[PDB]
């Protein structure tokens, strides 16, 4: 029948829920209750980066942990030397509206994308000193939400349709297409082992894919509202998820189950960016109420507040060496907290 | 000094970049970003091409440039996205105006146009952003009301209980029974406009035909009023 297999799907959902419950023996609080607190954490804006004209949406640290590319609505990607507060490059974009910004691990390319349905790849290191667009990846029928670099020749893009796409830059065509979402994907994070990646969509669900055949491994559904941020644990076997429920949820891949929820009573604003620390103990989430919160990833305790911002905090990213965390807000300000 | 020669030259490069940023900040502040929305039948694509005389396959944003009285605008049309606009529309929290174009020729699916306008109006991000509503292709409405094939009362029951508004200023050459339906649509949209306006934003109704030989001066005046109210809000107390 047309509705016959719906019952089978519901039975499978009940079976996976029962499996998750069976694997659920003790919560993370019950296991980490005997661990000393991280203490009261204070960080100050060591360097604030001025120069953007409009709201900053996206940022991404480089591998060297010194160069920082930031994307703003004026149509500009500025590359900052965070140590000296300089501007290495000021790339002017074709489309003023940009949602995502990436920085390749080799430091040769920066990827931008937005409501133009185009992932533009800019070659930083060229014989001519000007940064020229390498290639304009096209084939997405929706706004690009998160572009991330695998290597110098591959790039994973999560867009405004219910699809993610892995592109080979040289050929210019979609190497593979990941489908299975029923809403627009808004964030994307790649595992450290450059083999898996989790995508968070507006379905209140985060799906873990595998970039070798293009089929999803597991799906995690614990949220109520849409998902705006996602970030793997440094270990690579857990990932965080930021939503508009004013809750940040840490899931684990091996147990296929919710691990912990971070949500305080006086927080009713959504989360725009989530990033783990190098040790994974600090989960930094930039909320809509003009500030950021540094949760203890193993105690669900608000163990730090980062204050200075005049508008909505949009992007938030830690360095590879864990020295500093950079938060870019809608008031054209990047702040490097340490 | 205290820093090497290469760092001096890097600081000079940063200064040049900041100079370019200062130069194009003037262009950014002078230009008034405008959002453009409407259904498929609404002739926004026709407008954004008919105003050009006086002044990629799956691309998302189409940009139109035009200046009136040495004041330059930037209209953005969203063309290749999904039905759910809940997420990307927050990128237009700082646009000067929203131009909602409604096809008044077709009587069916006017209720869904009303619903779309209501969703635009009550959006959290779109609060404090006004709307320059354009009831486009009035020529087709005038032709159809004289055609006699279709009736307003079939789709809307309150038309019979609606006399012409006293503030109407129609051209005397048109049939006085046409302006009844012509202003009924405006009243229907203005009820949604005034339901929850409350002073942060207002709707600016207009009637636009196919070409009209001019459509940018209305936007000029309306945006002047919008920016004037925005500036006055700094003294409002």
């Amino acid at each position: 029948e047309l509705d016959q297999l719906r019952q089978e799907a519901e039975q499978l959902k009940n079976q996976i829920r029962d499996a998750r419950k069976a694997c659920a023996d003790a919560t993370l609080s019950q296991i980490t209750n005997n661990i000393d607190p991280v203490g009261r954490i204070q960080m100050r804006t060591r360097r604030t980066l001025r120069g953007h004209l409009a709201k900053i949406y996206a940022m991404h640290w480089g591998t060297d942990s010194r160069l920082l590319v930031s994307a703003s609505q004026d149509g500009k990607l500025i590359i900052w030397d965070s140590y000296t507060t300089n501007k290495v490059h000021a790339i002017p974009l074709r489309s003023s509206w940009v949602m995502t910004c990436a920085y390749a691990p080799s430091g040769n390319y920066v990827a931008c994308g937005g409501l133009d349905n185009i992932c533009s790849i800019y070659n930083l290191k060229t014989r001519e000193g000007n940064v020229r667009v390498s290639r304009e990846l096209a084939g997405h029928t929706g706004y690009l939400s998160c572009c991330r670099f695998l290597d110098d020749n591959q790039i994973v893009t999560s867009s405004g349709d219910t699809t993610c796409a892995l592109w080979d830059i040289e050929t210019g065509q979609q190497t593979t297409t990941f489908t299975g979402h029923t809403g627009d994907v808004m964030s994307l994070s790649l595992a450290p082992d450059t083999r898996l990646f989790v995508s968070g969509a507006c379905d209140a669900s985060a799906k873990l894919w595998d970039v070798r055949e293009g089929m999803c491994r597991q799906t995690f559904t614990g949220h109520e509202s849409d998902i705006n941020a996602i970030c793997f644990f440094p270990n690579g076997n857990a990932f965080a998820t930021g939503s508009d429920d004013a809750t940040c949820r840490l899931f684990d891949l091996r147990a296929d189950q919710e691990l912990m929820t971070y949500s305080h009573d006086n927080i009713i604003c959504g989360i725009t960016s989530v990033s783990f620390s190098k040790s994974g103990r600090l989960l930094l989430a930039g909320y809509d109420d003009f500030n950021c919160n540094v949760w203890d990833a193993l105690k669900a305790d608000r163990a730090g507040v980062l204050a200075g911002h005049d508008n909505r905090v949009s992007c938030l990213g830690v360095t590879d060496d864990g020295m500093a965390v950079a938060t870019g807000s809608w008031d054209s300000f990047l702040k490097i907290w340490n | 000094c205290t820093l090497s020669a290469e760092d001096k030259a890097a600081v000079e490069r940063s200064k040049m970049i900041e100079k370019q940023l200062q130069k194009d900040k003037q262009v950014y502040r002078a230009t008034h970003r405008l959002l453009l929305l409407g259904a498929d039948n609404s002739g926004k694509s026709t407008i954004v091409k008919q105003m050009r005389i006086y002044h990629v396959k799956t691309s998302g944003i189409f940009e139109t440039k035009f200046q009136v009285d040495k004041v330059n605008f930037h209209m953005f049309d969203v063309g290749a996205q999904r039905d759910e606009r809940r997420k990307w529309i927050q990128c237009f929290n700082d646009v000067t105006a929203i131009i909602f174009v409604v096809d008044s020729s077709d009587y069916n699916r006017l209720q869904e146009a009303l619903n779309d306008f209501k969703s635009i109006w009550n959006n959290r991000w779109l609060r404090t952003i006004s709307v320059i509503l354009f009831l486009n292709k009035q020529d087709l409405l005038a032709e159809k009301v004289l055609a006699g094939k279709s009736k307003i009362e079939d789709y809307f029951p309150e038309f019979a209980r609606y006399t012409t508004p006293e503030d109407a200023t129609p051209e005397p050459g048109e049939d006085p029974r046409v302006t009844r339906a012509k202003y009924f649509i405006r009243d229907e949209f203005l009820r949604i406009s005034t339901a929850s306006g409350d002073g942060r934003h207002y709707c600016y109704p207009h009637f636009t035909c196919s070409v009209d030989t001019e459509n940018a001066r209305r936007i000029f005046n309306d945006c002047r009023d919008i920016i004037q109210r925005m500036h006055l809000r700094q003294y409002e107390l």
Partner: single-chain antibody
Framework: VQLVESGGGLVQPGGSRKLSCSAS????????MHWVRQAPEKGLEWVAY????????YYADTVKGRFTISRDDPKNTLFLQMTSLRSEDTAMYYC??????????????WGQGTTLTVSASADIVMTQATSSVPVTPGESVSISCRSS???????????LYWFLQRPGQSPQLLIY???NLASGVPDRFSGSGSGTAFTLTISRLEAEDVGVYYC?????????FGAGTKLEL
């Protein structure tokens, strides 16, 4: 990218001469320009430098007032006026490209050069070995240089540059900051230093590596070159 120079020839002493460098193939606006002399038999010596925007102009002590530099950006050209050209100026001139930011590689491209012949100071002096090192192909060369001042700035960069000049074209960059390799040179080259003494090691010698190897410091202006160490086959 190419940098073609116009000028040069026989000039009487005390005269004036205008030399131009036309840059075709790259963004001339974002790049600093340098002028480098080379005597008919001796080595190199820095002359003048103009930055992006003509806002930071430097000269060597020996050319402090005699020469003046000027960049015309719209047509992508760099001129210099030479006043009171004495016999000490009978050197070939090179229009050297440069760019400065984090990770940048200054002194990338060198123009072919024009021959200008004239008829009849706490600088960081850099010293190399004798300009005669007998090396055969397939072996490892261990050129060495010494600096009068430690080039390790507080940043962590030793502003050292090693260049190669074949008997033909203009010198090309091999390594910058004593460790970083140039864009096009092979991986056979390497550089190791401690702040005062530096070594350029070629782990494998080929027939195209014959030439004269030149040193550079960049801690502070003026820029001192050194005599140069020559490899012979």
């Amino acid at each position: 990218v190419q940098l073609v120079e116009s000028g040069g020839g026989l000039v009487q002493p005390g005269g004036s001469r205008k030399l131009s460098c036309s840059a075709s193939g790259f963004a001339f606006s974002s790049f600093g320009m340098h002028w480098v002399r080379q005597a008919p038999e001796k080595g190199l010596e820095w002359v003048a430098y103009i930055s992006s925007g003509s806002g930071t102009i430097y000269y060597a002590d020996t050319v402090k007032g005699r020469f003046t530099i000027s960049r015309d950006d719209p047509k992508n050209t760099l001129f210099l006026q030479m006043t009171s050209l004495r016999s000490e100026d009978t050197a070939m001139y090179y229009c050297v490209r440069s760019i400065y930011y984090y990770g940048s590689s200054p002194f990338d491209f060198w123009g072919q050069g024009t021959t200008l012949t004239v008829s009849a100071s706490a600088d960081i002096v850099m010293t190399q070995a004798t300009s005669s090192v007998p090396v055969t192909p397939g072996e490892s060369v261990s050129i060495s240089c010494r600096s009068s001042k430690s080039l390790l700035h507080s940043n962590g960069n030793t502003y050292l540059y090693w260049f190669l000049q074949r008997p033909g074209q203009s010198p090309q960059l091999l390594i910058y900051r004593m460790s970083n390799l140039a864009s096009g040179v092979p991986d056979r080259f390497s550089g190791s230093g401690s702040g005062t003494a530096f070594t350029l090691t070629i782990s494998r010698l080929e027939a195209e590596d014959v030439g004269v190897y030149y040193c550079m410091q960049h801690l502070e202006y003026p820029l001192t070159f050194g005599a140069g160490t020559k490899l012979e086959l």
